[PDB]
């Protein structure tokens, strides 16, 4: 079936046409050396290290670029291939600096490992080396450019993924070098992957500078919480401290990339931390005390309260275990005002159909889509990897993309319609020049972010979008396996709260104000003491003290995501779990343990003693939160829209601007990014 029979050291292989020698060797299991090649970048033939031998051929070919012809036999451990590798390594190390004991790319150096395996053991180069002027291209990336082996991975990454076109090669010959002809700074939402991609220590991370070496690190596998994507990540510790953060290949979410924020905000887990239970004094001051005192006092004030007077608010970065425990407690107390700091329409079917408030099209479905429509979002700064997949499609499979909202600097070119929502009804009717596109285009997609729903005009725009989705589905033919409507959050705990049955907003708290608040990770400032009685007993649970902790009565320190096993959920319903890397500092504990012990003290002893039991509770409440890595299809948008069509609420005139316009705002969006004294350097540098 259009396949070809190829030979690798004699063994036969079936390969598709256009496939390369390197790829065939990999399909067999063999692995060709590399310096300039990377699956996710364009192909170049610079390093000359992938050179192998073809039976009945005088010249060695490049495995990265030569598509495999039928009948070829490839000799990988042949004298010619090995001599080619030896010569190429000789040349590479001719002018390299002897900086291996200073080079933070020391125990991770592909050049080291390949010199040891495929290279010789001594030098015949008795001449003088060269040296290069070191650039300065940002506060995150350190540049020692006398180590560049001119592979172009940085240039290609920038031009293709990050859409920057500001790195390049100025000069020619050995006098050539890489970088910007000027003192420009390279500050993107993705700047920081050039570090992992540079095979050598020419580009390094200034934060991680000199702090450790690879063979010291213990590596745990976890996920991000900064955004709602769930980027798979590696946390590398040393003697109980978090040293850095790395990506981890998940080709259906992030595919080897992660964001500047979630790779350089690990410093915020070391500042303004809550270490001890705290309580209000008689002078109103906050003072340290013990778990017994704090929990007993909270339970005492709980035994004299119920119904609407008790309320719970949850912010971002909170775990589904803590959410389900707080619910299973405030429900035995009969206060069902459990709320989020982020909003989703309560009208219509609201949180009653999982087909809503999701990326029904798998994050990987952008690679099959044809038209994409964005409503009130800067995905370049909220869920940047979504924009990354969008650009990957825009590059490979000629994607059409349009944006309804403010003029923004997407990393790619896009069609602009207007900053007002009424274009939604305009389209649905047909008085628009975009119906022409939607009509000839199959497999369309329409995605809307929570930043527009945070408005007061939150549900009207969503219902307009739903009606437009129906009209598109009936005009341009599409099956019921292709999904069209999508919702995108900035928050990692939202989907979990909504699948556990929370009220997506604060309207209930503003309606029936409480007298006893449980606020958990709510360092936003939406609620404050200008909205409550003069005697509201408030318990702040969290891992930083930024906004909600000072205006507190009792404070219970908790554990961050690098310090607990906990489930989070991304915009597409993919449940993922962290893994403990560093136990919490001091008296800090796990939130579900805290709430369980609190209930035990009060007299409401919960049935959850272990994490497996809490997970079985999550299973009973919603059985998807334990099928990790697996998404679950949904088929009830017809009913969702049937209902939502009966919701009268008029849109307003003011446009729908995104809160994150410039990279200056991508940083400092959560308490960890406010605590990080590196995000501040980046902000300052930008300004």
């Amino acid at each position: 079936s259009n396949l070809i029979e190829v030979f690798v050291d004699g063994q036969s292989v079936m390969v598709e046409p256009g496939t390369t020698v390197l790829q065939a060797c990999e399909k067999v299991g063999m692995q060709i050396p590399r310096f300039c090649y990377h699956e996710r970048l364009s192909v170049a033939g610079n390093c000359r290290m992938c050179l192998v031998e073809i039976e009945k051929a005088p010249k060695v070919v490049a495995a990265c670029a030569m598509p495999v012809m039928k009948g070829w036999n490839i000799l990988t451990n042949s004298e010619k291939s090995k001599k080619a590798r030896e010569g190429v390594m000789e040349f590479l190390l001719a002018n390299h600096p002897l900086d291996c004991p200073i080079c933070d790319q020391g125990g991770e150096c592909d050049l080291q490992d390949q010199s040891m395996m495929f290279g010789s053991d001594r030098s015949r180069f008795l001449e003088g080396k060269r040296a290069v002027e070191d650039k300065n291209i940002g506060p995150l990336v350190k540049t020692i450019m006398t180590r560049c082996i001119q592979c172009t991975r940085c240039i290609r990454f920038a031009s293709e993924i990050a859409g920057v076109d500001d790195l390049g090669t100025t000069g020619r010959g050995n006098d050539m070098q890489v970088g910007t002809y000027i003192e420009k700074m390279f500050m993107s939402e993705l700047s920081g992957n050039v570090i992992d991609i540079c095979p050598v220590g020419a580009l390094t991370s200034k934060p991680y500078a000199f702090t450790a070496r690879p063979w010291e690190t213990r590596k745990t596998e976890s996920i991000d919480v900064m955004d709602a994507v769930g980027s798979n990540i590696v946390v590398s510790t040393r003697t109980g401290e978090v040293m850095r953060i790395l990506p981890r290949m998940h080709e259906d979410i992030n595919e080897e990339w992660i964001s500047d924020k979630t790779r350089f905000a690990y410093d915020g887990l070391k500042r303004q931390r809550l270490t001890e239970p705290m309580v209000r004094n008689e002078k109103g001051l906050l003072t340290y005390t013990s778990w017994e005192d704090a929990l007993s006092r909270v339970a005492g004030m709980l035994q004299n309260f119920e119904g609407n007077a008790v309320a719970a608010i949850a912010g971002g970065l909170v775990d589904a275990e803590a959410l389900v425990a707080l619910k299973d407690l405030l429900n035995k107390v009969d206060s069902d005002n459990l709320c989020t700091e982020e909003i989703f329409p309560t009208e219509g079917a609201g949180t009653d159909l999982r087909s809503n408030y999701l990326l029904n099209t798998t994050i990987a479905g952008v690679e099959e889509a044809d038209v994409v429509l964005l409503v009130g979002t800067n995905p370049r700064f909220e869920a940047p990897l979504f924009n990354a997949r969008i650009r990957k499609s825009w590059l490979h499979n000629d994607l059409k993309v349009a944006l309804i909202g403010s003029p923004v600097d997407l990393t790619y070119r896009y069609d602009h319609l207007g900053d007002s929502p009424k274009i939604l009804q305009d389209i649905a009717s047909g008085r628009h020049s975009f119906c022409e596109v939607l009509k000839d285009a199959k497999k369309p997609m329409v995605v809307l972010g929570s930043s527009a729903l945070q408005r007061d005009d939150g549900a009207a725009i969503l219902v307009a979008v739903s009606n437009m989705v129906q009209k598109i589905r009936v005009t341009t033919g599409v099956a019921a396996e292709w999904k069209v409507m999508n919702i995108l959050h900035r928050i990692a705990s939202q989907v979990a709260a909504l699948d556990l049955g929370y009220k997506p907003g604060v309207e209930a708290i503003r309606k029936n104000p409480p007298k006893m608040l449980f606020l958990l990770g709510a360092d936003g400032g939406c609620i404050t003491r200008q909205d409550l009685p003069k005697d509201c007993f408030i318990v702040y649970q969290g891992h930083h003290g930024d906004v909600g902790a000072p205006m507190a009565d009792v404070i219970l320190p908790g554990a961050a995501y690098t310090e607990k096993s906990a489930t989070y959920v991304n915009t597409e319903g993919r449940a993922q779990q962290t893994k403990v890397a560093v136990t919490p500092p001091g008296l800090a504990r796990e939130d579900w343990k805290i709430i369980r012990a609190l209930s035990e003290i009060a007299g409401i002893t919960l049935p959850y003693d272990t994490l497996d039991q809490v997970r079985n509770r999550l299973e009973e409440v919603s059985p998807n939160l334990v099928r990790y890595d697996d998404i679950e299809e949904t088929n009830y948008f017809q009913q969702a829209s049937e209902l939502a069509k009966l919701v009268n609420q008029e849109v307003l005139a003011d446009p729908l601007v995104p809160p994150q316009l410039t990279i200056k705002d991508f940083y400092m969006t959560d308490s960890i990014s406010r605590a990080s004294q590196t995000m501040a350097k980046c902000v300052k540098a930008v300004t």
Binding site: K270, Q272, R273, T275, K283, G284, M551
Partner: protein, 47 residues
């Protein structure tokens, strides 16, 4: 030394010290690395 003297370098001890295993000027170990985790301190005025 008289014929083959050492290399005159500063930061070399002029006065030699003998074993101090129990004298009051002995060696006491400690950690040279600063504090890692900085805690949160709230203000000294309520609400």
């Amino acid at each position: 030394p008289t014929t083959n003297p050492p290399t005159a370098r500063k930061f070399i001890w002029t006065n030699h010290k003998f074993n101090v295993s129990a004298t009051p000027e002995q060696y006491v170990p400690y950690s040279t690395t600063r504090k890692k985790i900085h805690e949160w301190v709230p203000p000294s005025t309520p609400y």
